[PDB]
Amino acid sequence: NHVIFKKISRDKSVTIYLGKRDYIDHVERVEPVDGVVLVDPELVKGKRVYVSLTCAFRYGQEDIDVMGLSFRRDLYFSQVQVFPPVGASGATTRLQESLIKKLGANTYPFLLTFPDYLPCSVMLQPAPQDVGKSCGVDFEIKAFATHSTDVEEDKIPKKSSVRLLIRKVQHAPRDMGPQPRAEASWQFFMSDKPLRLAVSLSKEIYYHGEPIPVTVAVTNSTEKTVKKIKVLVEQVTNVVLYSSDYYIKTVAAEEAQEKVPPNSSLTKTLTLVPLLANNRERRGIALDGKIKHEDTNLASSTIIKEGIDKTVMGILVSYQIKVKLTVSGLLGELTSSEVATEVPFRLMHPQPEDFQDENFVFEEFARQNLK
C-alpha cells in the first residue's frame, strides 16, 4: 500500500497529491518532487493553475509568509503550469501515470526539480537562555489558481491555493571520509608528566538512530587521578544569514564508571545515540522540522558543495564527539580551564535504495503531533 499525501484548497477548486512528505538529498543528486493536481473543472473555468517549489531562509518568525518576519532570503524558486494542460500533458513518472488513472481526467502532472546548491531542512527555535530568534530553511510546494479581471489585474486568491511544507532530508553519499581520530596531551603546571587522551570512532558518517562507539584511551603518567570521563555528542549551529547566532548543545552524553589512577592507562568504548528523543528540551537545537511534529529529528550535518558560498546554506549544522576528563587537584588549584578534545563526524540518514499499478491509500499531508 503506497500512502499518497493530499491537501485541498479552501474553495475545493484545487487538490494537490504528493508521493512523499520528505524528498531525499544524497549529495550526488536530489529526488525531484513529482505529483498531480486534481482541479474541479467548473471552478477553474478560464483560470491558470501553477505549482511552485520555493526554498527560503527566514529569521524572526516561525514561517516564511508571516506579517513582519524580520528577514527572508529566497535560496531557490521554480514554477510550472498544470492547467490548462502543457504539451502532451502525459506523466513522466509511474507514480503520476498511476495517480492520473486512479483519480480521473481532471488530474494533471507536475515535476519540480531541486538543484545541488541548496541546504537540507534545518530550523531552530531558541530556548529561554539563548540570545537570537527563531530561524529556518523552509521548502514550500504551492499549487495556486490565477484569473483575470477586466481592469487588467490578475488575481491569486489564497482560497484557490494549497501550500505543503515538505522536508529536503540528507541521506549519505556513496563514499565517506577517513576514520575520525584525535590525540591530545596536557602537562599541568608543576608537572613533568603528560596526561594523554586518544579518541577514535568506527567511521566518519553515522545514521540517525545508529549507536556511535567512541573508543577512549587515557594514558595517565601524572600523579593525579582522572576522576571522571564524560563523552558528549555536541551539535554546533551557525546561523550565517542576517544574524551570526551560534549554538553548541549536548544532544547525547555518557559518563564512564571507570576512574584512571596515577601511572596507569584505561582503554574503553562508550556508545552514544544522538536523538531528539533524548532531549526533554527540544528548543535551542537545530531540527529538520517543527518541535510539535512527531516525524521531526535532529538536523543532519550540512554538506557544503565545492565552490558554493556557505552563506547560501543559511544555517550550518555540524556534530562532534567531546571527551572531557575531570582531573583531581586541578580545577581551582592548577587551571581555570577544561581538559577536553573534540572529534568531528557527520550525522545523516542511511544511503538510499539501489508491471501493474500500486494500491493507493490517501492521507492528509498535515504531519502528526506528539501527545
- Interacting residues with ligand IHP between 286 and 305 (CB under 6 A): 290
- Residue whose CB is less far from its own copies, 97 or 223: 223
Residue ranges in 129-158 that form contacts with ligand IHP under rule CB under 6 A: 155, 157-158
Angstrom distance (rounded) from CA 82 to CA 92? 13
Selection from its own copies, ligand IHP, none that 157 binds (CB < 5 to 8 A by kind) is: ligand IHP
Selection from ligand IHP, its own copies, none that 368 binds (CB < 5 to 8 A by kind) is: none
The least CB distance from residue 64 to ligand IHP, in Å, is 16
- Residue whose CB is less far from its own copies, 173 or 344: 344
Selection from its own copies, ligand IHP, none that 190 binds (CB < 5 to 8 A by kind) is: its own copies
DSSP one-letter string for 55-120: EEEEESSSSTTSTT-SEEEEEEEEEEEEES--TT---SSHHHHHHHHHH-TTEEEEEE---SS---
In which element (H, E) is residue 155 found? strand 154-155
DSSP, collapsed to helix, strand or coil, labels residue 310 as helix
253 near ligand IHP, rule: CB under 6 A: yes
- Contact window for ligand IHP (CB under 6 A) among 39-47, 104-112, 346-354, 360-368: 360-368
Of 17, 49, 56, the residue nearest 164 (C-alpha): 17
The least CB distance from residue 357 to ligand IHP, in Å, is 28
Residue ranges in 204-243 that form contacts with ligand IHP under rule CB under 6 A: 232
Of 278, 293, 273, the residue nearest 123 (C-alpha): 293
Angstrom distance (rounded) from CA 36 to CA 162? 13
Selection from its own copies, ligand IHP, none that 80 binds (CB < 5 to 8 A by kind) is: none
Selection from its own copies, ligand IHP, none that 250 binds (CB < 5 to 8 A by kind) is: ligand IHP
Q: Is 326 exposed, middle or buried (0-12, 13-18, 19+ CB in 10 A)?
A: middle
Selection from ligand IHP, its own copies, none that 213 binds (CB < 5 to 8 A by kind) is: its own copies
Q: Which residue is nearest to ligand IHP (CB)?
A: 157
Cell of residue 93, nine digits: 513518472
Whether the ω angle into residue 262 lies within 30 degrees of 0, i.e. cis, is no
Cell of residue 59, nine digits: 529569521
The least CB distance from residue 38 to its own copies, in Å, is 19
Out of 2, 29, 41, 74, point to the residue binding its own copies (CB under 8 A).
Answer: 74
Selection from its own copies, ligand IHP, none that 144 binds (CB < 5 to 8 A by kind) is: its own copies
In angstroms and rounded to an integer, the radius of gyration of the C-alpha atoms of the chain is 26
x/- track of binding to its own copies for residues 109-148 (CB under 8 A)? --------------------x-x--------x-x-x-x--
Selection from its own copies, ligand IHP, none that 276 binds (CB < 5 to 8 A by kind) is: none
338: left (phi over 0), alpha (psi -120 to 50) or beta: beta
CA 334 to chain centre: 42
- Residue whose CB is less far from its own copies, 333 or 358: 333
x/- track of binding to its own copies for residues 248-287 (CB under 8 A)? ---------xxxxxxxxxxxxx-x----------------
181 near its own copies, rule: CB under 8 A: yes
Of 15, 55, 49, the residue nearest 35 (C-alpha): 15
Selection from its own copies, ligand IHP, none that 366 binds (CB < 5 to 8 A by kind) is: ligand IHP
Residue ranges in 158-187 that form contacts with ligand IHP under rule CB under 6 A: 158-159, 163, 165
Q: Are 3 and 18 in contact (CB under 8 A)?
A: no
Q: Which residues, in sequence order, are CB contacts of 73 under 8 Å at separation 6+?
A: 56, 57, 241, 242, 314
Backbone angles phi and psi of 95, in degrees to 5: -55, -45
Q: Which residues bind ligand IHP (CB under 6 A)?
A: 155, 157-159, 163, 165, 232, 250, 253, 290, 365-367
